[PDB]
């Protein structure tokens with residue numbers, strides 16, 4: 001659902017409606 | 033009334049919030065350009081600036097523990113701090129205290145690097 | 155891996171997008187909300203109506219000419235009031251001579267008439283809004299005994315309304331317009347109100363950001 | 378564009394107006410000096426559909442007689458006359474609240490509304506080309522129906538009637554539906570709003586092929602209310618202030634003669 005993150009029209013701050021926790025998911029997947 | 037332009041300003045001053053209105057009485061259009069409940073008050077701006085003095089750019093847990101910016105969003109803190117220095121990346125200023133930014137003028141005047149949107153590109 | 159780079163570049167493009175939008179925002183960008191509007195954001199059950207009354211008599215010297223109401227009926231959406239809570243508002247003190255417009259659903263027609271007569275109004279009219287599709291046909295909704303294809307706004311009047319600041323037989327009592335987003339209302343009800351009362355004081359309760367207009371005092375929660 | 382071929386499709390569709398029924402077991406006629414001031418329980422009982430074909434003498438109407446609203450409370454509607462029946466009454470903008478309060482005092486719960494949106498005959502005639510009698514009006518309406526593909530480029534908002542009223546301009550006619558309980562309906566089979574092109578003199582006086590639509594709507598509200606001869610013995614539908622010459626089968630027509 002990578003393209004579903006921006007499928008809906010959110011406000012310019014909410015456009016990271018799922019990237020918020022990806023900001024740490026990337027870190028944890030880099031750890032292992 | 034007869035002169036509505038002053039009437040609306042007075043009603044905003046005496047009934048509306050300080051976020052919705054302004055000191056003179058004009059609409060805060062920046063408030064209405066964003067979703068309700070997600071607004072960056074200048075109080076949040078000065079709170080973040082004081083937090084830079086407290087700990088500076090780095091991890092954002094203790095900056096949201098004292099909650100200088102009340103009930104703030106962590107990624108919003110790590111994003112709005114970029115506009116303080118004018119650089120799209122903060123790897124050069126991690127875990128350090130800054131008194132005066134000193135970076136806006138030098139990074140804004142860099143003709144060699146990108147000057148778009150009052151910033152400096154990677 | 156590759157998805158890491160893709161998410162990084164997506165995040166980047168959004169980052170410069172947000173930076174550009176915020177740079178224009180903190181440079182004098184105009185919003186869709188008109189100037190010359192009075193957006194009170196508060197709770198109607200807790201609002202100090204005396205403060206609003208004093209402000210209205212201080213800045214205008216007289217009360218509202220038209221009061222539009224869109225009550226959140228306790229039929230079942232998520233932030234609704236009760237019938238007695240809506241009845242308890244000091245509407246009697248917010249208006250002396252003028253009209254009241256109440257958008258009444260079918261389930262709340264009788265109680266709407268009862269509240270209108272309780273506040274001291276004479277039920278004199280009601281405007282029907284008929285819902286149109288994209289093509290131009292009639293929109294069909296759920297029905298109780300008949301397929302509901304319209305919605306009614308009851309209009310009561312009180313006091314001396316023949317001051318010359320209102321007009322007779324201004325326009326049709328039918329509004330044939332397309333169905334916009336949920337719970338929204340057509341924009342030409344405001345045009346009909348302006349035809350009824352040109353350059354007057356108007357008050358809207360339970361208003362939203364969509365309903366903000368010129369010469370308009372709008373009170374709301376999400377507003 | 379206009380979609381008037383679909384808005385007025387019923388006006389030409391297979392909905393033929395019904396012919397008057399003779400005085401026989403399929404109908405019933407009653408002649409009374411006054412309807413409101415008379416006992417209606419002896420003419421029929423256990424009704425489940427009572428249509429009051431009332432033409433009110435409101436101030437908007439230009440002094441052409443009619444009933445008086447204050448006399449509606451005088452009407453006696455005993456529980457023996459109907460136990461659980463839907464009451465249809467022709468409303469006016471002046472007396473909607475009074476009618477609602479009177480039906481509440483009598484024990485009826487307001488449930489539904491029905492509206493007719495009125496288009497101008499003269500407006501359609503002018504769009505197509507560029508004291509009338511019933512026959513002339515009917516033939517003009519047939520002509521307007523025939524040339525339905527010519528004015529389809531117009532805007533519907535330019536065709537509505539604009540009748541005088543001290544507050545707004547009249548464009549619809551209203552039929553109120555009240556309920557009383559102490560019926561096996563078919564529910565959403567007819568739209569809540571209908572479109573009709575009419576003359577600008579007496580839009581309140583619903584004419585034939587428009588009253589026929591109302592009759593069919595009322596009759597399809599209650600499919601179990603059909604009066605099949607032989608199996609039944611009493612009529613369960615009544616109309617007051619009916620027409621002296623047009624007797625609808627299966628109805629009790631009461632004439633204020």
Ligand SMILES: Nc1ncnc2c1ncn2[C@@H]1O[C@H](CSCC[C@H](N)C(=O)O)[C@@H](O)[C@H]1O
Pocket residue numbers: 196197198199224225226233234235337338339359360361362365373374375376377
């Ligand atoms: N005290 C209160 N309780 C519940 N809703 C309230 C309220 N005061 C104001 N409201 C407003 O009433 C709205 C629902 S009424 C229906 C939506 C809106 N009024 C409209 O038709 O345009 C909510 O959005 C809320 O903002």
